[PDB]
Write an enzyme that holds these catalytic residues in place. Structure first.
Site, PDB file in Angstrom:
ATOM      1  N   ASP A   1      26.656   0.318 -40.002  1.00 36.15           N
ATOM      2  CA  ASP A   1      26.462  -1.078 -39.785  1.00 36.15           C
ATOM      3  C   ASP A   1      26.569  -1.844 -40.933  1.00 36.15           C
ATOM      4  OD1 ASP A   1      26.173  -3.778 -38.082  1.00 36.15           O
ATOM      5  OD2 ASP A   1      24.475  -3.332 -37.350  1.00 36.15           O
ATOM      6  N   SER A   2      25.937  -3.089 -40.871  1.00 37.16           N
ATOM      7  CA  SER A   2      26.237  -3.467 -42.631  1.00 37.16           C
ATOM      8  C   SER A   2      24.064  -4.031 -43.393  1.00 37.16           C
ATOM      9  CB  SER A   2      26.462  -4.928 -42.000  1.00 37.16           C
ATOM     10  OG  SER A   2      26.215  -5.536 -41.381  1.00 37.16           O
TER      11      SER A   2
ATOM     12  N   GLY B   1      23.120  -6.603 -40.897  1.00 34.66           N
ATOM     13  CA  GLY B   1      22.898  -8.148 -39.914  1.00 34.66           C
ATOM     14  C   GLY B   1      22.084  -8.156 -38.869  1.00 34.66           C
ATOM     15  N   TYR B   2      22.014  -6.861 -37.874  1.00 36.35           N
ATOM     16  CA  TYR B   2      20.972  -6.630 -37.094  1.00 36.35           C
ATOM     17  C   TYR B   2      19.411  -7.130 -37.398  1.00 36.35           C
ATOM     18  CZ  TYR B   2      18.958  -4.875 -32.567  1.00 36.35           C
ATOM     19  OH  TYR B   2      18.089  -5.143 -31.516  1.00 36.35           O
TER      20      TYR B   2
ATOM     21  N   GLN C   1      29.809 -14.151 -34.079  1.00 36.29           N
ATOM     22  CA  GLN C   1      29.034 -14.738 -33.488  1.00 36.29           C
ATOM     23  C   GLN C   1      29.107 -16.168 -32.302  1.00 36.29           C
ATOM     24  OE1 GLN C   1      26.178 -12.815 -33.571  1.00 36.29           O
ATOM     25  NE2 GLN C   1      26.718 -11.561 -35.384  1.00 36.29           N
TER      26      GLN C   1
ATOM     27  N   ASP D   1      28.363   1.649 -29.585  1.00 35.60           N
ATOM     28  CA  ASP D   1      26.807   2.040 -29.761  1.00 35.60           C
ATOM     29  C   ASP D   1      25.907   2.044 -28.630  1.00 35.60           C
ATOM     30  OD1 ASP D   1      26.889  -0.146 -30.736  1.00 35.60           O
ATOM     31  OD2 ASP D   1      24.483   0.774 -31.608  1.00 35.60           O
TER      32      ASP D   1
ATOM     33  N   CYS E   1      27.693  18.326 -14.650  1.00 35.44           N
ATOM     34  CA  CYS E   1      27.703  18.376 -15.847  1.00 35.44           C
ATOM     35  C   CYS E   1      28.287  19.644 -16.710  1.00 35.44           C
ATOM     36  CB  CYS E   1      26.155  17.800 -16.833  1.00 35.44           C
ATOM     37  SG  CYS E   1      25.950  17.426 -18.829  1.00 35.44           S
TER      38      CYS E   1
ATOM     39  N   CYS F   1      27.873  20.367 -20.103  1.00 34.55           N
ATOM     40  CA  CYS F   1      27.523  20.444 -21.498  1.00 34.55           C
ATOM     41  C   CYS F   1      26.202  21.938 -21.233  1.00 34.55           C
ATOM     42  CB  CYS F   1      26.056  19.414 -21.470  1.00 34.55           C
ATOM     43  SG  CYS F   1      24.486  19.755 -21.527  1.00 34.55           S
TER      44      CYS F   1
ATOM     45  N   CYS G   1      23.205  21.763 -19.310  1.00 29.88           N
ATOM     46  CA  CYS G   1      23.215  22.452 -17.543  1.00 29.88           C
ATOM     47  C   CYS G   1      23.706  23.475 -17.447  1.00 29.88           C
ATOM     48  CB  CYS G   1      23.682  20.884 -16.776  1.00 29.88           C
ATOM     49  SG  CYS G   1      22.604  19.517 -17.409  1.00 29.88           S
TER      50      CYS G   1
ATOM     51  N   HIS H   1      21.981  16.330 -23.620  1.00 33.56           N
ATOM     52  CA  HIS H   1      22.350  16.763 -22.382  1.00 33.56           C
ATOM     53  C   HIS H   1      22.733  14.939 -22.899  1.00 33.56           C
ATOM     54  CE1 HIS H   1      22.512  15.812 -17.982  1.00 33.56           C
ATOM     55  NE2 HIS H   1      22.118  14.754 -18.362  1.00 33.56           N
TER      56      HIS H   1
HETATM   57  C1  LIG Z   1      20.726  -2.730 -29.420  1.00 34.46           C
HETATM   58  N1  LIG Z   1      21.610  -3.951 -29.126  1.00 34.46           N
HETATM   59  C2  LIG Z   1      22.358  -4.861 -30.357  1.00 34.46           C
HETATM   60  N2  LIG Z   1      22.520  -3.520 -31.416  1.00 34.46           N
HETATM   61  C3  LIG Z   1      23.356  -4.759 -32.544  1.00 34.46           C
HETATM   62  C4  LIG Z   1      23.706  -4.528 -33.279  1.00 34.46           C
HETATM   63  C5  LIG Z   1      23.698  -3.169 -34.699  1.00 34.46           C
HETATM   64  C6  LIG Z   1      21.536  -2.321 -34.875  1.00 34.46           C
HETATM   65  C7  LIG Z   1      22.100  -1.425 -34.664  1.00 34.46           C
HETATM   66  O1  LIG Z   1      20.690  -0.914 -36.110  1.00 34.46           O
HETATM   67  C8  LIG Z   1      20.764   0.277 -35.572  1.00 34.46           C
HETATM   68  O2  LIG Z   1      19.845   0.298 -34.791  1.00 34.46           O
HETATM   69  C9  LIG Z   1      18.407  -0.315 -34.790  1.00 34.46           C
HETATM   70  C10 LIG Z   1      21.694   0.817 -35.219  1.00 34.46           C
HETATM   71  O3  LIG Z   1      22.708   1.791 -36.978  1.00 34.46           O
HETATM   72  C11 LIG Z   1      23.008   2.342 -36.767  1.00 34.46           C
HETATM   73  C12 LIG Z   1      22.253   0.154 -34.668  1.00 34.46           C
HETATM   74  O4  LIG Z   1      24.032   0.554 -34.823  1.00 34.46           O
HETATM   75  C13 LIG Z   1      24.197  -5.387 -33.880  1.00 34.46           C
HETATM   76  N3  LIG Z   1      24.931  -5.330 -35.500  1.00 34.46           N
HETATM   77  C14 LIG Z   1      24.898  -6.361 -36.156  1.00 34.46           C
HETATM   78  N4  LIG Z   1      25.232  -5.994 -37.542  1.00 34.46           N
HETATM   79  N5  LIG Z   1      25.548  -7.526 -36.074  1.00 34.46           N
HETATM   80  C15 LIG Z   1      25.416  -7.972 -34.618  1.00 34.46           C
HETATM   81  O5  LIG Z   1      25.407  -8.687 -33.901  1.00 34.46           O
HETATM   82  C16 LIG Z   1      24.796  -7.034 -33.399  1.00 34.46           C
HETATM   83  C17 LIG Z   1      23.858  -6.817 -32.482  1.00 34.46           C
HETATM   84  C18 LIG Z   1      23.372  -5.792 -31.988  1.00 34.46           C
HETATM   85  N6  LIG Z   1      22.790  -5.883 -30.398  1.00 34.46           N
HETATM   86 ZN   LIG Z   2      23.845  18.071 -18.949  1.00 37.61          ZN
END
Ligand SMILES: CNc1nc2c(CC[C@H]3O[C@@H](OC)[C@H](OC)[C@@H]3O)c3nc(N)[nH]c(=O)c3cc2[nH]1
Ligand SMILES: [Zn+2]
Ligand SMILES: CNc1nc2c(CC[C@H]3O[C@@H](OC)[C@H](OC)[C@@H]3O)c3nc(N)[nH]c(=O)c3cc2[nH]1
Ligand SMILES: [Cl-]
Ligand SMILES: [Cl-]
Ligand SMILES: [Zn+2]
EC number: 2.4.2.29
Lengths: 369, 369
Positions: free
Chosen positions: B93-94, B96-97, B189, B266, B304, B306, B309, B335
């Site tokens: 991920d970049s 952006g979150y 977006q 994810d 399951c 795994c 289990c 699990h």
């Molecule tokens: C939970 N809901 C959710 N996750 C989101 C993530 C991943 C967060 C990423 O931040 C880390 O976790 C905090 C993880 O990084 C590997 C996750 O994949 C998003 N990433 C970006 N770039 N843009 C979005 O609009 C966005 C929206 C989200 N909504």
């Molecule tokens: Zn299991």
């Protein structure tokens, strides 16, 4: 099929011995290091991983398991082996160390010790709990005498432990299934005093046990003193039975104790200090948290055959431990336990080949360089 | 040898698709669940265990890795794959979150975002960090618009993200090694607004990406609203490229999102909630800490496949989690991730066989019984 218990000595060098203990659930190669799994887990490791490192036997603890999840509960669930998924021998300590370490929680009497919710331990109840757990090697219920101790108090404590050893023997023998399938070890006490150690050894040999532990050491006395006590104490024990030094120890402690006739060891050092960032190497311990490891691509130890050293760098493990990541604890623990098992293997092989004294010298020269 | 990137759709049912993404480091079966490994570890699991559960790809995060251990440091050490010991594809991920979730640490501008020690992210720096990590699927630098958002603010945020998407594209393309070996996904977006989602999709398609994420959801809107937005948003994306719903989600969220055309997911739910004691089962989630499990000899889930289990009881895992034991986290996590992968496998197989709608119905009836 394997016997309930048979200890065989295959080779000797000075006071050092190497051999095997055969039991129903497996063979234990001696000298043996026994990982500690107090609460029905060797912390941060699956049982398969513990086995992969070379461990033949692990430890559980009567006191801790009595409290959580409960001895009767574990029995209802099929015993400790099934519960935790370790099918090889398990040695259970009796609670006698906790009599000392948690003494502020306690009320002591000739009958036993009550810990305060109240829980009671006595020779009879300790042996019963170990039965409920399905222990393979049952330890007599003793008291680990505090250190330092005056000669009077050391004598009083040892004498009580010997009365408790006889009660432990009788409780074990009266339970047919336990007597036929498990083994019972007595624990020598007497603090640092030769005469008391002799009286204790004599009392234990008169009662008769499958193995003999040296109790009351690794309680702050330091290596010089521990070795001095071992020098006279181990020869007092029956030669043809295993000698178990409880709570030891650092790698050099183990080597010196083997030189003095010890066959079995347990210690939380590799597990606990691993989680804390200390890794054992043939060039001495390192603390992986140190900044000097942040870009070090080498494995924890340059020779170690463990899966951790085959795959991951110091730099990665440094990052994990600094970050508080569970995988850091897992990797450090696997490596340290594997290191301890490789140490035991080198000890066994060198005794078998009549070059243990040279091994001990070489080991020390490099470990303390 | 495998191409840089090729997405093939093998079978369809309604809006649902199943197929494969081929990349240099491996094949990703879709619909795919991607375990989250933010800090260069999927928490409490060795990479081999993550793979054993069925995962084809895992996630890392630009923001977290930039801070610890550092992007340049990871590059010096040979890249994220070597560093953590996962040799298959990694999506990063970049940041952006985190622009949204940690906004109180931030100063935002058209150039990028500075987090406060100060660390800067911009489309150019985010793409550069992802290159330094050696990411296989690089995400455009966006802003996850906060929820709820007014139409004006949602539009402003989306418009900036689209300008940043073009900057991300150009930064990626200008770095030859990255352009030739990795893939770049754009992020749609527009909050919950159909017109803004359309403008965003159109802008991303005009720029052109290897895959298209639906961003800005799983931020508190709830399932009904999320599904409503997916209903119109996913068809706006190019049909022939993967559709990635970021941050989703619970098992029923995943099933409904696949019904709406999503190919990739994810979420930290299986890992994080596993450590907290929540286990996923085909009969719904359970909290293993509950006293009702203290003597339950059944595995976490009755079907399951795994390793957890196969070997350990609810009772044992209950004990571990109550005791705060690391092995409890390890077993719960393995699990839950295995459960998620089995869900994805059932989804893929049912779409392949033209019985996904029936699977979704059966799944829901039992999971929510
Ligand atoms: C939970 N809901 C959710 N996750 C989101 C993530 C991943 C967060 C990423 O931040 C880390 O976790 C905090 C993880 O990084 C590997 C996750 O994949 C998003 N990433 C970006 N770039 N843009 C979005 O609009 C966005 C929206 C989200 N909504
Ligand atoms: Zn299991
Ligand atoms: C560290 N040094 C040391 N350990 C010792 C232990 C094991 C503690 C046991 O308690 C749990 O750890 C706290 C472990 O239980 C599995 C350990 O084996 C001892 N046990 C008994 N019964 N009697 C002793 O005289 C004794 C002396 C010790 N010295
Ligand atoms: Cl420990
Ligand atoms: Cl997580
Ligand atoms: Zn190692």
């Amino acid at each position: 099929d394997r016997p309930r218990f048979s200890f065989s000595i295959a080779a000797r060098e000075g006071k050092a011995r190497t051999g095997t203990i055969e039991m129903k659930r497996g063979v234990i190669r001696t000298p043996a290091f026994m990982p500690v799994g107090t609460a029905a887990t060797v912390k941060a490791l699956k049982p398969e991983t513990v086995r992969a490192t070379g461990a033949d036997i692990i430890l559980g603890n009567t006191y801790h398991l009595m409290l959580r999840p409960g001895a009767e509960r574990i029995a209802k669930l099929g015993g400790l082996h099934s519960f935790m998924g370790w099918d090889r021998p398990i040695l259970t300590d009796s609670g006698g160390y906790q009599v000392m370490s948690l003494s502020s929680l306690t009320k002591q009497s000739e009958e036993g010790v009550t810990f305060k919710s109240r829980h009671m331990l006595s020779p009879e109840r300790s042996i019963e709990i170990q039965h409920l757990l399905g222990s393979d090697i049952v330890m007599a219920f003793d008291e680990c005498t505090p250190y330092p101790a005056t000669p009077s108090r050391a004598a009083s404590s040892m004498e009580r432990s010997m009365r408790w050893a006889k009660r432990s023997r009788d409780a074990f023998d009266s339970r047919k299934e336990q007597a036929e399938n498990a083994a019972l070890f007595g624990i020598q006490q007497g603090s640092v005093f030769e005469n008391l150690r002799q009286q204790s050894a004599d009392a234990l040999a008169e009662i008769g046990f499958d193995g003999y532990a040296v109790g009351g050491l690794a309680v702050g006395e330091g290596q010089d003193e521990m070795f001095r006590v071992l020098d006279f104490s181990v020869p007092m024990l029956p030669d043809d039975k295993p000698h178990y030094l409880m709570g030891v120890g650092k790698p050099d402690d183990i080597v010196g104790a083997v030189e003095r006739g010890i066959d079995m060891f347990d210690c939380v050092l590799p597990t606990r200090s691993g989680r804390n960032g200390q890794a054992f190497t043939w060039d001495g311990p390192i603390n992986i948290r140190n900044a000097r490891f942040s870009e070090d691509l080498k494995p924890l130890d340059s020779e170690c055959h463990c899966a951790v050293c085959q795959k991951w760098s110091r730099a990665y493990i440094h990052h994990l431990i600094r970050a508080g990541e569970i995988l850091g604890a897992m990797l450090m623990t696997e490596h340290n336990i594997a290191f301890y098992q490789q140490l035991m293997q080198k000890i066994r092989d060198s005794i078998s080949e009549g070059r243990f004294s040279q091994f001990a010298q070489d080991f020390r020269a490099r470990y303390f360089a």
